[PDB]
Amino acid sequence: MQVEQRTLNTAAHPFQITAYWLDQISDAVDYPIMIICPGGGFTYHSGREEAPIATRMMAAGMHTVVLNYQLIVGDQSVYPWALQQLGATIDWITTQASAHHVDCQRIILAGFSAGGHVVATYNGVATQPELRTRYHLDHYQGQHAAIILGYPVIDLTAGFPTTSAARNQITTDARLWAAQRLVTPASKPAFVWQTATDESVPPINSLKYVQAMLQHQVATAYHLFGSAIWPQLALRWLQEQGLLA
């Protein structure tokens, strides 16, 4: 693989992304790509779990890109900047698509914890014209085919953060507080998983989202483990969705 470091800029909010470009086996066919939005309660970007995951997925045959979305650091708000940064990243991939043999019909978004909120919201926002124009995403090219959420934060009042003050710090746009309440038949398929022993992020968050998803008849998969397992289920699910090639 080839590692590419970049600093992109959109809506005057520069962000960092690391692109892990898969290398051809013969050294030609196109491979899927996964964008990873890390956890970190919007105070930092997590990497302890993200590193092993990015590797696992790639081994299955796909490119990966870690998207260090907007944080609250420096007295800032996460939204709507984070969505714009995501759409721009999907865009940055289409331009790199040919040079690195990237299948643009199989772009997958993956979010964890605080990162899961960004990915879950984008799944509701980037899927509706009204929303794409409202949050300025009409000029970005490309679209995702699905998402993977691990112990994701869905509702900004269902546990995390603990104070309304930290909530509004994330964003004062209540319309973006609850990702589940953005799910429409247009949302892309999603694979959700989490442990029932997680104290950092309330399991109800997952349930809330999975329900909405099920209500609007959108392909889904929920795995709430009781206590290497989920990666296998996720990969098998991606095959089912025909997103693995």
Residues forming contacts to a second copy in the complex (CB under 8 A) are 189, 191, 196, 203-204, 207, 210-211, 214-215, 219-229, 232-233, 236-237, 240-241
> Shortest distance, CB of residue 139 to a second copy, whole angstroms?
33
Q: Under a CB-based contact definition with an 8 Å cutoff, are residues 224 and 194 in contact?
A: yes
30 interacts with, out of a second copy, Ca ion, none, CB within 5 to 8 A per kind: Ca ion
Structural tokens at position 48: 């302890």
Nearer to a second copy, 96 or 211 (CB): 211
The amino acid sitting at 245 is A
- CA-angle at 128, arms to 241 and 81, nearest 5°: 100
> Shortest distance, CB of residue 108 to Ca ion, whole angstroms?
17
> Shortest distance, CB of residue 97 to Ca ion, whole angstroms?
7
Q: Does 91 participate in binding Ca ion (rule CB under 5 A)?
A: no
Gap sites in the chain (C to N > 2.5 Å), preceding residue numbers: 27, 227
The amino acid sitting at 227 is S
In the stretch 125-164, what mask flags binding to Ca ion with x, by CB under 5 A?
----------------------------------------
Distances (CA, A) of 142 to 1, 97, 106, 137, 242: 23, 11, 10, 11, 18
Return the number of other C-beta atoms located less than 10 Å from residue 79's C-beta. 21
Structural tokens at position 26: 């013969």
Nearer to a second copy, 167 or 223 (CB): 223
232 interacts with, out of Ca ion, a second copy, none, CB within 5 to 8 A per kind: a second copy
Size of the site for Ca ion (CB under 5 A): 1
141 interacts with, out of a second copy, Ca ion, none, CB within 5 to 8 A per kind: none
9 interacts with, out of Ca ion, a second copy, none, CB within 5 to 8 A per kind: none
Question: How many helices (H) and strands (E) would you count in the chain?
Answer: 7, 8
Among 8, 30, 222, 241, indicate the residue that binds Ca ion (CB under 5 A).
30
82: nearest Cα among 120, 46, 50, 54:
120
- Using only the alpha carbons of the chain, give its radius of gyration: 17
Phi, psi of 148 (to 5 degrees): -130, 130
Nearer to a second copy, 27 or 199 (CB): 199
> Shortest distance, CB of residue 190 to a second copy, whole angstroms?
9
Contact residues: Ca ion, CB under 5 A: 30
